[PDB]
Amino acid sequence: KEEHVIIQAEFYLNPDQSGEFMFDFDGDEIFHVDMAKKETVWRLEEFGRFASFEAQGALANIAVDKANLEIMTKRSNYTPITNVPPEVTVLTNSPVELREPNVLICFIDKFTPPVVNVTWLRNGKPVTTGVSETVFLPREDHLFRKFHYLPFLPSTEDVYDCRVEHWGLDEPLLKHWEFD
């Protein structure tokens, strides 16, 4: 069969002017390059103590991807991409026990283009404390995946929702979660 796969994935999107450069190992992100700060961001802190990567090379690659997108757009005769709405699922990363720290995971999958707006809601109100997220992960079908996280304290009083906005969706999608 096949034991492992390492993928260097990058993209450039117009008219948003969004680019991304990342390395993937068996579906997990090793690191990506922050375009604003022009730096290598490791998925897990310890990765950086074992290896390195010059962010500069990524910036140069993106410039070329931007130029190739221009060429291809005109060559395709300005054929736009077809929006593919995401499948959204919310789960905890471990079995929930009342008053025991846990994490809600918003899994956004199988969509394109790579642009989404995600917000967490606690009893209907946006929450930002401690939240984090991944960049857009590549898929073999060339669609994308993305994860959003929300550390929280389980209780019978709160309800949560992962609100996702995407152009393939007619209306913002809410995925509900509450203790049962």
Binding site: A9, D26, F47, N68, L69, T79, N93, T112
Partner: protein, 190 residues
């Protein structure tokens, strides 16, 4: 409202490893929107257009021996090199799963119930979960969630067993994973 059309371009270099790094295949690909247009397959040795849009590029890139040569050696200078660089924390990463067993819904004995075997926080994804009833393996009535990748280099999976608990019965979840020599087991007594 934003309705302006979008144009996406992707470039992917995929290194496929078989038997350690004994066999390696490099796959380079360009995708316009959701369509692969051209690719370089190390097993082929040169670029090939996938769609009509990639025709110009394959012909062009194949006309530069320098590029072809560099690409044909990437299996060594790129793929094998990166495998070695990250081997210690990727290929060799091992995190033991946390196993918990609990009944779905608290129902009295002799009534159908779903026993949940929760396996979380493990890595790599390769794992085996089996249910045992009074020492014997239950191959039927097993409802699995499958492998769930959490996105933080950790996996989880919920394997449930359909049962009709009766006092005296001992149900065991057995888990095999590369992080432990002997399988982990958690018992639930009705």
């Amino acid at each position: 409202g934003d309705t302006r059309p979008r144009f996406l371009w992707q470039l992917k270099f995929e290194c496929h490893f078989f038997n350690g790094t004994e066999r390696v295949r490099l796959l380079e690909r360009c995708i316009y929107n959701q369509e692969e247009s051209v690719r370089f397959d190390s097993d082929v040795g040169e670029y090939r257009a996938v769609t009509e849009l990639g025709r110009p590029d394959a012909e062009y890139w194949n006309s530069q021996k320098d590029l072809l040569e560099q690409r044909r050696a990437a299996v060594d200078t790129y793929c094998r090199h990166n495998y070695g660089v990250g081997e210690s924390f990727t290929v060799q990463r091992r995190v033991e799963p946390k196993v918990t067993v609990y009944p779905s819904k608290t129902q009295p004995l002799q009534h159908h119930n779903l026993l949940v075997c929760s396996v979380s926080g493990f890595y790599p994804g390769s794992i085996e979960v089996r249910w045992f009833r009074n020492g014997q393996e239950e191959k039927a009535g097993v409802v699995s969630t499958g492998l769930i990748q959490n996105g933080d280099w950790t996996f989880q999976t919920l394997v449930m067993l359909e049962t009709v608990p009766r006092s005296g019965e001992v149900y065991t979840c057995q888990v095999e994973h590369p992080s432990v020599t002997s399988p982990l087991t958690v018992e639930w007594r009705a």
